Amino acid sequence: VNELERINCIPDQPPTKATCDQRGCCWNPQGAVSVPWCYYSKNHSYHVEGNLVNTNAGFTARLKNLPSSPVFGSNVDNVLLTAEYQTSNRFHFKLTDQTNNRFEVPHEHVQSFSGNAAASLTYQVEISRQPFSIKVTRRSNNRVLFDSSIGPLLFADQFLQLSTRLPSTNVYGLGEHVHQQYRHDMNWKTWPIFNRDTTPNGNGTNLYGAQTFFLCLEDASGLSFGVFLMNSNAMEVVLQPAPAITYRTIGGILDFYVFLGNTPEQVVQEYLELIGRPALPSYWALGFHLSRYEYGTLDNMREVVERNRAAQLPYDVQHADIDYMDERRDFTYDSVDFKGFPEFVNELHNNGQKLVIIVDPAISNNSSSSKPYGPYDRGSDMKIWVNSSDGVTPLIGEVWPGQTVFPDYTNPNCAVWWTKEFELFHNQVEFDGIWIDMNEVSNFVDGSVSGCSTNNLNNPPFTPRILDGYLFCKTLCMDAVQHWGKQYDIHNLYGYSMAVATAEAAKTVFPNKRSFILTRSTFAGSGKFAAHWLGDNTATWDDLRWSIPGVLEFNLFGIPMVGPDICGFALDTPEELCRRWMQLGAFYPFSRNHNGQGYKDQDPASFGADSLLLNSSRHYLNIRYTLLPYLYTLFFRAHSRGDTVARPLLHEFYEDNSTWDVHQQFLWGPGLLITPVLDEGAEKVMAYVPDAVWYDYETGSQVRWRKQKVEMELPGDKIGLHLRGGYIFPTQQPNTTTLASRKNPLGLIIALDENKEAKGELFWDDGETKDTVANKVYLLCEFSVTQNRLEVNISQSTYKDPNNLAFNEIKILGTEEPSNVTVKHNGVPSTSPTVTYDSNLKVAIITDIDLLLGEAYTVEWAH
Ligand SMILES: *[C@@H]1O[C@H](CO)[C@@H](O[C@@H]2O[C@H](CO)[C@@H](O)[C@H](O)[C@H]2NC(C)=O)[C@H](O)[C@H]1NC(C)=O
Ligand SMILES: O=S(=O)([O-])O[C@@H]([C@H](O)[C@@H](O)[C@H](O)CO)[C@H](O)C[S@+]1C[C@@H](O)[C@H](O)[C@H]1CO
Ligand SMILES: *[C@@H]1O[C@H](CO)[C@@H](O)[C@H](O)[C@H]1NC(C)=O
Ligand SMILES: *[C@@H]1O[C@H](CO)[C@@H](O)[C@H](O)[C@H]1NC(C)=O
């Protein structure tokens, strides 16, 4: 056994030979740091009993436990392997107890399969019987992708483990964590996963959400695969330099999907086809959002709103945090400090802005005839709370308002209660979207106001390395009871079920509209319902750097609308850090400046009406808003096809191994390269320039750099932004709200490749109606340039914007002087455009044109 391939047999304590001998493992304390001293022998585990059986979907096998000493308790003697060839690119296998039903995740999107095995498989499955292992190989090159033979299968009631070899160390994903780097290096590292309210800091703890998906780029050809584990129990994932990854969970079943693609993007697409593609956002949610914990008063909030509006900051959304509430209780507002809240909502709406309100799941249980508290009274009438282990008494915990009960969102009746609370509240305060927080669920006491009984749920045989080392820390008792089952099994599904219920509420409160839901806690598939933010970060340079991998990973997880608290939630933000963070933050798919209680103001205009920070923030937000049609089209592709929005360089440039590690730059889709300064004091950044033609976004000048590391000069007022040759970017003149910007003239930026060609597309619908894609009420058009000619082609034509929108400007980068520009509509001229040319920069701008959105055109020129 190569020591890199040793699978640790003593995950639970300091290794000893006595424990090693008792567990029947191998002892060799002579390795390098972190190399396990005690590791599994070659026949710990299961063997296939008798023959495999073909089924319509695939095959089954019966696995029988080989005699072994019971470490983490009640072992499963007879295991059933069920394998389904679900599609040419997706394999599913699950290991269950042949004799007993066990907890299975009741996912809202994924359904059971009742097909026949797919034809033309891109993969092959090999089963070894003595001992059991499962291998999945890529058919084209026989690359072993999944191979459990490196380790045993362990399957006890509260301890399940399976390992797989990996074909490379280009491994991305898992969550929710602060990984600091984007590529997992595969050095010995254990990542615990158990939804927890905790600071995203440098400690690598489990955080708010649970995401078991990873993607592996196999080699420079782009061939990639992914693995998803459908299990909601506390678990950890162990990475080691074999390379290999081990999943170790403390309940449920091992239900695995393996996805193959020809590129990293195809793997994400296959994963999202399974778990659910992300919602198309309201176009206004793409704008800039501003927020803080504790304005304290409506007057204070108004003062902030007003100075940022006075500054002409692009600024669509204002969030109201728990300070709007009457004593931090949901579905109230403070009639003194927030007196006149409804009037302020009208002011926002009149200014073309939106209000997003925070709503917490925990509900104050303080109600009497003297002073009733409606949401509690109504929820109690409907009996929709999470109960204690007795199965009948609502569990009492403590959150913002004091003592609280917790809604059981797994109960469909709970969604009815919740919907009605929102309806009642929306009648008083006409908010536009909902920010659901503290939904891990977060509890200010451990378990309940009376703690947690000692039993195998609260105190299991094995505890993964979750923060604080007890499952019930800062959450509910594990033996609490909900419709879908015990908190031990469904804890990781709380925020997911809450997002589903809040989407259901939206159906009534915002009829036929998308609205906007922002959630803290997530499970696989949450992006179908909600955006995410990366939680309670801190105003440090490390937190700035750590945000980009967090954004990229959530795009892999199908939650493309993701971002951190720009400038940092905890602590007073230094001007220089906030200026850099706003520059980068103009390019997060979810762009929100948010701040914790009591800290110095960090809203952009608070730095001074003529400050470098405000000027730079306005500048780059104006660029963001200019590219909103491009961004919105990226979201359309994420929703319809499963593409990422914020995208690693390697997804586009996988042929170039210099991109495999890059985590300080990222792309919007295929075409826009973002290069922030991320180091204190720096007016430069060490940047990678991929193998493409690149143009400076502002000047349009072609950079000399190609496929090389560069020192990019970025003074205090700059972030790197370059456009990829071969791409056409739709734009729209910016305004301070998207309500207004959407009415503005459109533009095209055509970034020519080495062959003087480029292609692009534009999706356009009404920006807010639900089912616009499903019901085919949209415009989709395609742009292509191949010399001397731009074609605008209409592929879907079932929405016509009433605002007379047209492309009134075409900017061509990397071109020789165009002459005789002519515009044809369905073959007919047209009215001579104006052409301006910069021969030093090789940039042409065509103006005095009017190409109506949704009409086909050819624009031709000579040289
Ligand atoms: C939590 O406990 C309540 C009782 O406090 C349970 O309420 C039951 O709800 C159903 C309505 O679906 C009624 O038919 C029963 O009469 C209720 N019981 C009582 C005693 O009122 C509720 O089911 C419990 N929830 C869970 C997840 O077990
Ligand atoms: O620090 S804290 O006092 O602010 O409480 C944190 C958290 O609870 C923290 O204490 C962790 O335990 C690790 O520090 C809580 O998450 C803040 S919530 C989400 C945020 O975005 C809203 O503005 C806040 C008000 O609704
Ligand atoms: C780890 O946790 C504690 C927070 O309670 C903190 O003081 C320490 O700085 C953290 N370490 C890092 C690297 O974030
Ligand atoms: C920008 O929005 C304002 C509304 O606040 C509107 O009056 C103005 O005309 C818009 N500017 C344009 C057309 O670019």
Curated annotation (Swiss-Prot):
Region (Maltase): 264-645
Swiss-Prot/TrEMBL keywords: Cell membrane, Disulfide bond, Glycoprotein, Glycosidase, Hydrolase, Membrane, Multifunctional enzyme, Repeat, Signal-anchor, Sulfation, Transmembrane, Transmembrane helix
Tissue localization of expression: Broadly expressed. Highly expressed in small intestine. Expressed in granulocytes.
Sites where the protein binds acarbose: 197, 321, 520, 536, 594
Cysteines engaged in disulfide bonds, as pairs: 9-25, 20-38, 567-578
Localisation per UniProt entry: Apical cell membrane
GO function terms (MF aspect): alpha-1,4-glucosidase activity; amylase activity; carbohydrate binding; catalytic activity; glucan 1,4-alpha-glucosidase activity; oligo-1,6-glucosidase activity
Domain P-type: 1-42
Post-translational modification: N- and O-glycosylated.
Biological process annotations from GO: dextrin catabolic process; maltose catabolic process; starch catabolic process
Protein family: Belongs to the glycosyl hydrolase 31 family.
Record's miscellaneous remark: The displayed isoform 2 sequence is inferred based on alignments, homology, conservation, expression and longest protein. RNA-seq transcriptomic analysis supports all introns in a single sample. No single full-size mRNA sequence supports this isoform yet, however it is clearly identified by mass spectrometry analysis.
Quaternary structure and partners: Monomer.
Chain's role: Alpha-(1,4) exo-glucosidase involved in breakdown of dietary starch oligosaccharides in small intestine. Cleaves the non-reducing alpha-(1,4)-linked glucose residue in linear dextrins with retention of anomeric center stereochemistry. Mainly hydrolyzes short length oligomaltoses having two to seven glucose residues. Can cleave alpha-(1,2), alpha-(1,3) and alpha-(1,6) glycosidic linkages with lower efficiency, whereas beta glycosidic linkages are usually not hydrolyzed.
Protein name: Maltase-glucoamylase
Taxonomic source organism: Homo sapiens
Residues shown, of full length: 93 to 954 of 2753
